[PDB]
Amino acid sequence: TADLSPLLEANRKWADECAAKDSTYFSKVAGSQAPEYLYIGCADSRVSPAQLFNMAPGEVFVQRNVGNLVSNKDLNCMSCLEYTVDHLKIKHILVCGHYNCGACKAGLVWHPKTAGVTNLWISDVREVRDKNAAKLHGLSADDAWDKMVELNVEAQVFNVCASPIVQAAWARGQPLSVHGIVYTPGTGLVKELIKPITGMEDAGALLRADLKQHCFFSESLA
Amino acid sequence: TADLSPLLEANRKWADECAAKDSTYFSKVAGSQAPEYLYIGCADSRVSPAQLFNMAPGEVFVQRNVGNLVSNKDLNCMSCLEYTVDHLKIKHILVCGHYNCGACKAGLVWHPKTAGVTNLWISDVREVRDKNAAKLHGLSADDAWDKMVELNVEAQVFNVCASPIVQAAWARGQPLSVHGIVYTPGTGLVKELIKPITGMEDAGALLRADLKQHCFFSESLA
Amino acid sequence: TADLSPLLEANRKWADECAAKDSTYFSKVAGSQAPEYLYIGCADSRVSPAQLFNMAPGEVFVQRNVGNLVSNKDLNCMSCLEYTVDHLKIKHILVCGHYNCGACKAGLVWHPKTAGVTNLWISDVREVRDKNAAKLHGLSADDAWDKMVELNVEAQVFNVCASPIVQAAWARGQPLSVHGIVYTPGTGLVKELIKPITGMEDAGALLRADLKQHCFFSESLA
Amino acid sequence: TADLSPLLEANRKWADECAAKDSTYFSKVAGSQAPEYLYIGCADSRVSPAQLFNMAPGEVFVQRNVGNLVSNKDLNCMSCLEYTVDHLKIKHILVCGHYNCGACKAGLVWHPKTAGVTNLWISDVREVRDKNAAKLHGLSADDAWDKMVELNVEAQVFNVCASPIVQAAWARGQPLSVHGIVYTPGTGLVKELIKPITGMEDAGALLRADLKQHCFFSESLA
Ligand SMILES: CC(=O)Nc1nnc(S(N)(=O)=O)s1
Ligand SMILES: CC(=O)Nc1nnc(S(N)(=O)=O)s1
Ligand SMILES: CC(=O)Nc1nnc(S(N)(=O)=O)s1
Ligand SMILES: CC(=O)Nc1nnc(S(N)(=O)=O)s1
Ligand SMILES: [Cl-]
Ligand SMILES: [Cl-]
Ligand SMILES: [Zn+2]
Ligand SMILES: [Zn+2]
Ligand SMILES: [Zn+2]
Ligand SMILES: [Zn+2]
């Protein structure tokens, strides 16, 4: 059966207990939100940002897609970025990858001829991979996987920092930080991969790739 | 200001307590997932699917985006759908809108010349709206907003049922149900807007738009 | 063989004759362009806009895709629109469909479960189709095809007029017209389907769908 | 100002003369096409493929977009590619850049905070640029611009060869060649930047990026 009764019952029991412990738990967000965080993470069923950070409704705005990817040409992720940064004025963007991420493994192993949309989607993972032969080759299957996850976080942090939305927000002096983090489904713990990046100065210090030259390329020419 | 230790500490507290309540809580999903559900919902910070359904990790795979939109030409939501239906073999897709959704309100009130990627992204909403313009005619602002949310949930349920991925899964006799639900941020409760749709028969019964005609349109030419 | 010699030879012979008849034919566009037209048409090999209009280099900027489709969420077509309208200040946008357009036929006949990217792409054609059962049903295969082509032109003209780019240009008083036209591969002739639309006043007169209500929807509510 | 009769009349003049020179010119492509080529080139008004190769209708299927970009996650250029390779069985794909391409120049000079969809769309160009930053270092503006155009043609040739569609066609032994060419708007001439690539062997010989490593990367893990 496809009956939803038991699901709905679990929700009702949850909202009942929540509101019993704190009468304004839901009511205070009945007509507005003011989260301080955007989280961009993987769609993987093991990785729920509000649960894992013990956040209540109204604290974290969420984009989740296969592989936690950020591209300037993806209107879905870019709309979550633009709405949160420009209208909600969130303060912090958490870019979260996770170990055991099948999208990262498929990015390592699949032949690109593979049919379907997921294989198109994870092209970004191949691009990150391809720039890192030297860190990936010769590693055990497992270690290569872990490394791919990590490299993917770093690249997606760079993409968030280089995004027109973040770049415009920094240029107008809006406070905005970007965090590279990674989660372990099998332990429920988050680790910090990259320390906070609050602007171009921190990005030059903390990112391998050169954000400054990316933004001001013309200054590297004759 | 931007330091993460407080968040990390909340995450550690949380993981210890879950491990203390059940020591296989995380470890049993360390290397695989077998969720039964895919949830497609809004990125709004007040709506966290695993939390609101009181699910543990490994139970609901998640796509969240501004206004809970589903289009065959978004590779972001389409890859969540492909991976879950084709590879994980989920059984149920929950398509969840929410009252007080500002993407629905913007789809009613914004002029389309408005700059930025969010206005591009909510084009889908304007189309749902335009197709149902007579239903929205003359309603108070609040009523029109609530009706916009509901019409959009019905439209995204139709889009999920009409998708190549779901249509192909049904053609091969894979059991797969689609659910139109709505959440009220001010109460924490889910309501079922549309009963379970398990196939074409259900869709003919339950949807205002004609899925059979969409799938077999050319049978009505001379 | 994949040798390009004969192709290159045909090009050299062409550029030689062109420049022999008119010494500045190429040189005057060696370092800038100032076209007055954007053309959005089908990628079909039988339909070449500069040939069919007898235009020389520098007169018509071109987007061509399968089915001549225009969506606010397609960065490829939207970049051609934005660059031409905002930077080149073109004056006229030709939206050209063509009879015998296999994309329009596939939009009529394909089952949506059909695999691959083209089937995703032509979802727009289904949406136009779906809004027109009354004009399509009961027609011969051939007449339905022709009608689909025509309806698709009209819808894509509306999409160009409703685009944020065109809407912004009209709001600042930039002169910009939009033309619905159709080509017959088997005769080489263009026909005018919709007369010129130079702004909101003409669009209310010449488009079936209501552009004004689309742009100012809020004014239809209580 | 916006009336089309002059354009329509040029079109009639042109069609009569072609029919007068050869009375089966149009009629022989009235109901089908069998082009041998797919051309992917820039939307720039100075570059019209059928004209510059002196082709009649039915010879070259065309995708044109700002900066002649090819990405697996653009359904617009991917559907041109799928339809031609899989259904029309074209033999040759021409990937054509052009000197004096302002999309290449913007990819060197724009800051990424720049508003609008064109800046999103040329992100691909910035990535080609960033990967080849040492080649562009210290060149005069003109030299860097010409080198940008060339590096982008090579990158889009690689992207075409790496695409699922071409890779699958080669895996099935379909003959299909890919060509890197460049056009000079000021002279009307095409130059061949990269010799014909007919398969993996050719690609290994001719491309600066390693297509074999992209396709079989995981063979180099432990
Ligand atoms: C083909 C493919 O993407 N495989 C995946 N496996 N696990 C995934 S996860 N972490 O995104 O849920 S995606
Ligand atoms: C322009 C716009 O989209 N406004 C939004 N307001 N709330 C949104 S929500 N519910 O997606 O967080 S989107
Ligand atoms: C599946 C599909 O799209 N079929 C096509 N047939 N002809 C086309 S055309 N006019 O775009 O070249 S596309
Ligand atoms: C910002 C930008 O893209 N500028 C352009 N200039 N010329 C272009 S062309 N060769 O695509 O017509 S694009
Ligand atoms: Cl979530
Ligand atoms: Cl063309
Ligand atoms: Zn994952
Ligand atoms: Zn919402
Ligand atoms: Zn066509
Ligand atoms: Zn160009």
Author numbering:
A (entry chain A), B (entry chain B), C (entry chain A), D (entry chain B): 6 to 227
Sentences from the paper on this structure:
Carbonic anhydrases (CAs, EC 4.2.1.1) are metalloenzymes, which catalyze the reversible hydration of carbon dioxide. In order to learn more about the molecular mechanism of β-CA, we have determined the crystal structure of β-CA from Coccomyxa (Co-CA) in complex with five inhibitors: acetazolamide, thiocyanate, azide, iodide, and phosphate ions. Co-CA is a homo-tetrameric structure with one dimer present in the asymmetric unit. The catalytic zinc ion binds to the side chains of residues Cys-47, His-103, and Cys-106 in a tetrahedral geometry with the fourth ligand expected to be a water molecule in the native enzyme.
The structure of Co-CA in complex with acetazolamide, Co-CA-AZM, was refined at 1.9 Å. The maps show well-defined electron density for the entire acetazolamide molecule and for a neighboring glycerol molecule, both before and after refinement. The binding and orientation of AZM in Co-CA is similar to what has been observed in human CAII, and human CAI. The amide group of the sulfonamide part of the inhibitor is situated 2.0 Å from the zinc atom and positioned in a tetrahedral geometry. Furthermore, the amide group forms a hydrogen bond to the Oδ2 atom of Asp-49 (3.1 Å). The O1 atom of the sulfonamide group forms a hydrogen bond to the Nδ2 atom of Gln-38′ (3.0 Å), whereas the last oxygen of the group forms no hydrogen bonds but is in van der Waals' contacts with Val-71 and Ala-108. The direction of the inhibitor is restricted by its thiadiazole ring, which is sandwiched at the "channel gate". The two nitrogen atoms in the thiadiazole ring form hydrogen bonds to a water and a glycerol molecule, respectively. The nitrogen of the N-acetamido group forms a hydrogen bond to a water molecule, whereas the acetamido group itself is buried in a rather hydrophobic part of the active site cleft. The Ki of acetazolamide binding to Co-CA is 1 µM, which can be compared to the Ki values of acetazolamide binding to human CAII, human CAI, and pea CA with 0.01 µM, 0.2 µM, and 28 µM, respectively.
